Design a protein around this ligand. Sequence first.
Ligand SMILES: CCCCCCSC[C@H](NC(=O)CC[C@H]([NH3+])C(=O)O)C(=O)NCC(=O)O
Ligand SMILES: CCCCCCSC[C@H](NC(=O)CC[C@H]([NH3+])C(=O)O)C(=O)NCC(=O)O
Lengths: 216, 217
Amino acid sequence: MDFYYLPGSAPCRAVQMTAAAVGVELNLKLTNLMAGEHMKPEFLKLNPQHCIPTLVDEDGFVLWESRAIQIYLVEKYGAHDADLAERLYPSDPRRRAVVHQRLFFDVAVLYQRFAEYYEPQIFGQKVPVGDPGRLRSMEQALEFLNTFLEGEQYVAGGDDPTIADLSILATIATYEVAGYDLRRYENVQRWYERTSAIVPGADKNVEGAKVFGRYF
Amino acid sequence: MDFYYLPGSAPCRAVQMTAAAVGVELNLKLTNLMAGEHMKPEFLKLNPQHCIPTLVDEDGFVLWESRAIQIYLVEKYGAHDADLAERLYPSDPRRRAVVHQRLFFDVAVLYQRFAEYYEPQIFGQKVPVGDPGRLRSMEQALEFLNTFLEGEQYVAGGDDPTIADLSILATIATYEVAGYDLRRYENVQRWYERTSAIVPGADKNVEGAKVFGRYFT
Ligand SMILES: CCCCCCSC[C@H](NC(=O)CC[C@H]([NH3+])C(=O)O)C(=O)NCC(=O)O
Ligand SMILES: CCCCCCSC[C@H](NC(=O)CC[C@H]([NH3+])C(=O)O)C(=O)NCC(=O)O
């Protein structure tokens, strides 16, 4: 399976942790966005949305959006270990609803506001001073996550990390390298330390996050 | 089942269409966001993210994010009709991945870029002259959708509308009612017309969108 990725990219790292958890190797294909490699006719034919991560399965199926890829990996390549797939992606509709909820929270709120705050600080204008509105917004997202983790081990509940934890771990590892003091959010910091110690490929998440950290 | 919502809200309308498809009757609870009804202590207890739509099910289980609600409606409350659930939310991992991919596209790209430009105008934060980047962003998003719909009846493929169609139907209705010219996107217009003609609860999508349209008089 061809995996078009960048080590520094959070959504790429979330798929990497998921693939390691289900036990499938990825054919790593580094796609330099700065050299416009995502804009070459070869990549565009595969992915008109020209974004990473992009997964190309051996049957020719092309898939993007990291969280769609996460679910796909569990559903297709996790069947060999029912209990594992169940831990990562519980089949009970109510339990799965919270997992889905947190996945959408990650893309639309937690990672989104992170990007809306730090991308102006490292690209284009490169302003070191962060907009007070964008900071308030991003902190509100951390406030939300902290509340979700109140009296809970993991982001969508349960006794084991789910793919929602893997997605948000990639995201929050990026928060850490960006210089944000996560210790302000005691539940988040506790969860971040817990999850990093136990999930497969977590060391490769910290490793890739540091590559993103070169921008600051 | 309690449904905290506003008719003008696209994500709310996507849930309404999904519930109509699986025969779920929602107890509609108008949540006036301008009056701060979503910031009231009782609502915050249910939903600390203080956002609509919010579903409270028969056991008091609380769920928000429209697309997670959509899935929950099909998986749990659509399971009485195996064939219908399969049309709305196919179980094949590849087909389901495209549905998921399109749902994420809607939240993170299509609706996201819409809201960034148009939603300020609801709150009164409308700037008469703005950044060209915000306009290019919506154009680009609509180009992607039009490309996905090339040679295809529906947004995630297949012979029937999925929850991805209902999500994007609610979003595109909002584009149209806000005044966006969709004519350069022939596949989008064609898909919108044909999908709106056949999906249950489509009337309330149009009606609800019109309520949103009253902000752009
Ligand atoms: C050091 C690493 C720097 C990269 C960090 C940004 S991730 C790159 C970006 N990808 C995305 O934002 C995809 C997000 C998508 N929601 C997902 O989760 O997969 C991209 O391909 N953007 C280019 C494009 O969309 O055209
Ligand atoms: C009458 C039409 C007025 C326009 C309403 C826009 S939707 C309102 C908004 N909700 C959302 O954007 C939720 C989006 C979420 N991604 C979903 O799909 O459910 C909200 O509750 N915002 C309040 C908040 O989050 O605090």
